[PDB]
């Protein structure tokens, strides 16, 4: 019989504020406009080097900020006089984030020289009874308008569709599409954002590397695995995350190759010559974004951060922030042409040499909040249990056991044994802060006591009821 | 407004695309005419205000980047002044040595800075007189990609597509602009005609002139 | 003895058995945390909130 | 196999009954005076993945 | 029993790729390089179930 138990210890995992306070003190902080001079369709590299001449930035990438903040402690105040460092410990908890964005309209856009094209089947142009050899066109697109933006304080998974391993179903093989497997891991800088086919290596699934542009070939697109996050109990890789995102077909293409697999071709009655053929089963939809209004923007307006997503209240694990941003709508794509040498009083496109450039701008300004841990033992097997590494960072210690007997035949000293034999951890990691490329933001030596006259300021004060002057009214009437 | 010019810079159509080309021959462009976007903006100061543009930035000796590649663009920021051009779609930026065709675009925008509201600057100022109110009404859209005549100057690696054959072994211009549009005109998008009661104002100075 | 139980299992369907992931956690879902939201009020909320556009 | 979204996804849900299952405590429960069912009174359709039509 | 029905068409994933019959042959025939297309489904069940009698 069942006949339940029911059923223990899960055990759960309990909201960090019940043993932290929030305290009236805050410093506030900020950045000083990080512009950037990208090129997207491309990189623009130095055609004699490997080092960049305008490095890859695009509006349609994740520009992942690894924010580095250092600890209250070790960077401690002579205001605490009423806190112990025994009974207590201090972290930061940022308590708004305001991103200031306002670089000229203009919007993001990508291409392809030789995108993999036969004819137009959204309506026919042609009738064919096979599909090309060799046809491919100059044809522009962007993928679609993305706008996102999440806070968090280790770093967030992505998904994408890797290459997988050779199945009965589908095998990587010719005459036969690959298999594609789940390939999760974390959000690069300047990782893609979605085709329109999704969030997929097209480095290793595109053999031909010539049907989509040459900026994502290279890249990974990756979407953001929201599930597994939320999943989470914890919920430190993010707390925050908002989209808003669209597409749109502006018309299918047909592509100039066709299926080696099977279509069943009994299922329909075959004619004579090209109606006994079958000539397209490769058509594509090709993606595109939409009209772009400029009234209405996550960004430019403070976020009231507190009781945050999972067990995280939005307290600082580690002293981090990680930012992940795509803009689309303000990411000009400048068009410009100077000439090489101007001898000529006539125009020729072999004198005056186009040239692009990308311009990706963001700023962060920030109000914290300090507050304090209050310790004691169950508190302290609670944070062990989380992520040892914050207790130590502090430095309370060690914390026997484990503890362990090993058993193997000695002198001593070794000499005879397994032998010998060392084992090396390793020592070194791949360190996890650096993952992966992140876009360095320091406000170590950027904080302030300074806490109103900030916009930011001025708008914390609104929110604690009102103050201050002039708020409204505002505009306004009639 | 309609502006156009008779010399536009145009090769090709790459928003559903017909043809394909290589690199540019001689003389592609072509009698086109333009609606520039929706863009109403209005800010009430006193003290003029502060505009951002990308101007003209760092030497070609200070950096690595030819002459025919342009000098780097570098946002130099200034202050509006009548009789200044506006932001164009192609982002705000001098159109004067940024154009050595100089008739890229049309006629009135050939010369001359283009500006955006340094918003940034003017708002962070902790005493706000280089504004104190605005409020703005704007939007663009792609009417249609084109293709720039005009030589690729850029560096394109190559060995990043598996090659074709002849023509599509050939490398086309990758010079794309976009063409913005600001149509559809409705009488419910003005945001002027209307009054604002400055009470208060919305700065950090409550509207208080100051010289009058 | 057959023909034939059962009438249920006569169409084509995304079988999907459920009869062994009962549980009774709500804070370890996300799914329980939002049911929280709504009912025992509780979650415990925010989230986050004001403000995040 | 075909996997499109213009295809009806029927998932067929087969369940037991709380008798065939979990009983935590047995108090006012008599298989007598009344006997017990599943109401399943929250559910969550999940459905992110990248776009595509 | 439960019965769900979902059409999903919005997000529904359809991805491109290709296998070469070898990278030496500097063609696009449909018979090089063999274009293919995929479909990616996902979905996501939970459930919380509130007991009666």
């Given at each position: 019989?069942?006949?339940?138990?029911?059923?223990?210890?899960?055990?759960?995992?309990?909201?960090?504020?019940?043993?932290?306070?929030?305290?009236?003190?805050?410093?506030?902080?900020?950045?000083?406009?990080?512009?950037?001079?990208?090129?997207?369709?491309?990189?623009?590299?130095?055609?004699?080097?490997?080092?960049?001449?305008?490095?890859?930035?695009?509006?349609?990438?994740?520009?992942?900020?690894?924010?580095?903040?250092?600890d209250?402690?070790k960077?401690?105040?002579?205001?605490?006089?009423?806190?112990?460092?025994?009974?207590?410990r201090?972290?930061?908890?940022?308590?708004?984030?305001?991103?200031?964005?306002?670089?000229?309209?203009?919007?993001?856009?990508?291409?392809?020289?030789?995108?993999?094209?036969?004819?137009?089947?959204?309506?026919?142009?042609?009738?064919?009874?096979?599909?090309?050899?060799?046809?491919?066109?100059?044809?522009?697109?962007?993928?679609?308008?993305?706008?996102?933006?999440?806070?968090?304080?280790?770093?967030?998974?992505?998904?994408?569709?890797?290459?997988?391993?050779?199945?009965?179903?589908?095998?990587?093989?010719?005459?036969?599409?690959?298999?594609?497997?789940?390939?999760?891991?974390?959000?690069?800088?300047?990782?893609?954002?979605?085709?329109?086919?999704?969030?997929?290596?097209?480095?290793?699934?595109?053999?031909?590397?010539?049907?989509?542009?040459?900026?994502?070939?290279?890249?990974?697109?990756?979407?953001?695995?929201?599930?597994?996050?939320?999943?989470?109990?914890?919920?430190?890789?993010?707390?925050?995350?908002?989209?808003?995102?669209?597409?749109?077909?502006?018309?299918?293409?047909?592509?100039?190759?066709?299926?080696?697999?099977?279509?069943?071709?009994?299922?329909?009655?075959?004619?004579?010559?090209?109606?006994?053929?079958?000539?397209?089963?490769?058509?594509?939809?090709?993606?595109?974004?939409?009209?772009?209004?400029?009234?209405?923007?996550?960004?430019?307006?403070?976020?009231?951060?507190?009781?945050?997503?999972?067990?995280?209240?939005?307290?600082?694990?580690g002293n981090?922030?990680?930012?992940?941003?795509?803009?689309?709508?303000?990411?000009?794509?400048?068009?410009?042409?100077?000439?090489?040498?101007?001898?000529?009083?006539?125009?020729?496109?072999?004198?005056?040499?186009?040239?692009?450039?990308?311009?990706?701008?963001?700023?962060?300004?920030?109000?914290?909040?300090?507050?304090?841990?209050?310790?004691?033992?169950?508190?302290?097997?609670?944070?062990?249990?989380?992520?040892?590494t914050i207790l130590e960072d502090w430095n309370?210690?060690?914390?026997?056991?484990?503890?362990?007997?090993?058993?193997?035949?000695?002198?001593?000293?070794?000499?005879?044994?397994?032998?010998?034999?060392?084992?090396?951890?390793?020592?070194?990691?791949?360190?996890?802060?650096?993952?992966?490329?992140?876009?360095?933001?320091?406000?170590?030596?950027?904080?302030?006591?300074?806490?109103?006259?900030?916009?930011?300021?001025?708008?914390?004060?609104?929110?604690?009821?009102?103050?201050?002057?002039?708020?409204?009214?505002?505009?306004?009437?009639?």
């Amino acid at each position: 019989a069942t006949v339940y138990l029911p059923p223990v210890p899960v055990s759960k995992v309990v909201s960090t504020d019940e043993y932290v306070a929030r305290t009236n003190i805050y410093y506030h902080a900020g950045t000083s406009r990080l512009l950037a001079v990208g090129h997207p369709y491309f990189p623009i590299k130095k055609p004699n080097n490997n080092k960049i001449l305008v490095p890859k930035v695009s509006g349609l990438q994740y520009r992942v900020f690894r924010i580095h903040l250092p600890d209250p402690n070790k960077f401690g105040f002579p205001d605490t006089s009423f806190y112990n460092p025994d009974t207590q410990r201090l972290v930061w908890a940022c308590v708004g984030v305001e991103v200031g964005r306002g670089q000229p309209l203009g919007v993001g856009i990508s291409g392809h020289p030789l995108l993999n094209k036969l004819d137009d089947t959204e309506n026919a142009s042609a009738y064919a009874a096979n599909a090309g050899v060799d046809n491919r066109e100059c044809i522009s697109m962007d993928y679609k308008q993305t706008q996102l933006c999440l806070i968090g304080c280790k770093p967030p998974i992505g998904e994408h569709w890797g290459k997988g391993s050779p199945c009965t179903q589908v095998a990587v093989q010719p005459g036969d599409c690959p298999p594609l497997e789940l390939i999760n891991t974390v959000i690069q800088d300047g990782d893609m954002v979605d085709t329109g086919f999704g969030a997929m290596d097209f480095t290793t699934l595109q053999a031909n590397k010539s049907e989509v542009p040459l900026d994502i070939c290279t890249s990974i697109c990756k979407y953001p695995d929201y599930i597994k996050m939320v999943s989470e109990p914890y919920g430190d890789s993010l707390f925050f995350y908002l989209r808003r995102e669209q597409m749109f077909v502006r018309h299918l293409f047909n592509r100039a190759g066709t299926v080696g697999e099977n279509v069943p071709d009994d299922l329909y009655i075959k004619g004579s010559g090209s109606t006994a053929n079958l000539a397209s089963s490769n058509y594509f939809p090709t993606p595109s974004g939409s009209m772009v209004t400029s009234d209405a923007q996550i960004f430019n307006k403070p976020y009231w951060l507190q009781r945050a997503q999972g067990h995280n209240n939005g307290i600082c694990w580690g002293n981090q922030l990680f930012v992940t941003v795509v803009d689309t709508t303000r990411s000009t794509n400048m068009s410009l042409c100077a000439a090489i040498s101007t001898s000529e009083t006539t125009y020729k496109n072999t004198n005056f040499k186009e040239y692009l450039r990308h311009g990706e701008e963001y700023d962060l300004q920030f109000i914290f909040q300090l507050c304090k841990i209050t310790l004691t033992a169950d508190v302290m097997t609670y944070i062990h249990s989380m992520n040892s590494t914050i207790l130590e960072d502090w430095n309370f210690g060690l914390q026997p056991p484990p503890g362990g007997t090993l058993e193997d035949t000695y002198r001593f000293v070794t000499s005879q044994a397994i032998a010998c034999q060392k084992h090396t951890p390793p020592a070194p990691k791949e360190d996890p802060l650096k993952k992966y490329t992140f876009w360095e933001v320091n406000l170590k030596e950027k904080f302030s006591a300074d806490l109103d006259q900030f916009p930011l300021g001025r708008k914390f004060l609104l929110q604690l009821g009102l103050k201050a002057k002039p708020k409204f009214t505002l505009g306004k009437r009639k």
